[PDB]
Amino acid sequence: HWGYGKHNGPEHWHKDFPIAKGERQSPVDIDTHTAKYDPSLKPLSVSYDQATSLRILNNGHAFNVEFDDSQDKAVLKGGPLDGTYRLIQFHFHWGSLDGQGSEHTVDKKKYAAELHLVHWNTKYGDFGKAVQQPDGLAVLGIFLKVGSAKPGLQKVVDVLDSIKTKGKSADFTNFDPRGLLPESLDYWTYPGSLTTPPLLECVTWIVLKEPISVSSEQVLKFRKLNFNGEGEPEELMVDNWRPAQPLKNRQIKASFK
Ligand SMILES: O=C(O)Cc1cccc([N+](=O)[O-])c1
Numbered sequence: 325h326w327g328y329g330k331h332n333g334p335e336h337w338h339k340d341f342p343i344a345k346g347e348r349q350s351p352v353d354i355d356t357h358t359a360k361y362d363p364s365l366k367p368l369s370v371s372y373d374q375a376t377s378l379r380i381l382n383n384g385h386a387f388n389v390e391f392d393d394s395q396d397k398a399v400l401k402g403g404p405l406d407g408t409y410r411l412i413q414f415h416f417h418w419g420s421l422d423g424q425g426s427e428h429t430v431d432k433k434k435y436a437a438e439l440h441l442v443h444w445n446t447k448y449g450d451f452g453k454a455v456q457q458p459d460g461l462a463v464l465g466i467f468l469k470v471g472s473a474k475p476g477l478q479k480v481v482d483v484l485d486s487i488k489t490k491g492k493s494a495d496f497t498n499f500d501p502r503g504l505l506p507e508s509l510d511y512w513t514y515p516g517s518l519t520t521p522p523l524l525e526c527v528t529w530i531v532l533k534e535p536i537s538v539s540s541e542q543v544l545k546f547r548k549l550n551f552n553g554e555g556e557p558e559e560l561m562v563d564n565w566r567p568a569q570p571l572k573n574r575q576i577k578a579s580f581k
């Protein structure tokens with residue numbers, strides 16, 4: 325019964341999941357000076373025109389916006405990837421304060437939040453099988469800084485009062501995730517893991533260099549969510565980020581000079 329506290333947070337997870345101390349754990353600090361520009365990188369293709377959002381769920385640690393992943397409707401390809409990766413869900417990690425919240429860091433800088441668009445490799449047939457493979461997932465990570473509002477985020481923010489507590493869901497159709505992307509698709513990439521239990525080492529991370537801007541008010545609404553279930557003491561859903569882990573024997577590659 326894991327979480328983000330003193331008693332059950334990141335620093336305890338290894339007792340249940342020894343892979344927490346593995347060779348390709350996420351997130352990491354991105355040392356921009358040491359990331360090497362890679363000309364082998366094929367261009368990134370984000371094809372979200374046919375996306376079909378279905379539902380938004382408070383899963384007790386975050387909220388997930390879920391997609392129909394039963395066809396190639398929203399796919400990621402190119403970049404460092406071989407083959408086609410289908411969007412299953414997106415979620416965020418965020419802080420109690422604007423000065424922290426991201427999982428990845430950039431030259432030790434923490435952003436207020438980080439958006440994760442999770443895709444699985446269609447060669448494995450479904451998500452569950454894909455997470456058992458070293459190349460099973462591709463996660464597109466986007467930093468959030470506080471400034472101007474992100475118009476394309478407001479629909480997500482406004483429904484959060486309907487899923488305040490763990491296990492609540494709401495219909496969430498017709499949401500266009502294109503409205504959450506920055507202008508540039510320049511990126512860093514490296515091999516890593518999921519950042520909650522079970523910490524599986526199945527992710528090709530693709531972290532965009534350009535953050536999106538959200539308003540103070542938008543992020544405040546994230547912080548009104550609850551980790552707890554209804555009828556349990558209230559514990560605000562904040563600081564649901566794992567800190568940076570050792571890079572070990574990995575290289576971070578840059579798609580840009
Ligand atoms: O890495 C995370 O944010 C945690 C996590 C946990 C379970 C599934 C996830 N997913 O990527 O579908 C992500």
Ligand code: NI
Nearest residue numbers: 325326327521
């Ligand atoms: Ni548990």
Ligand code: NI
Nearest residue numbers: 415417440519
């Ligand atoms: Ni995540």
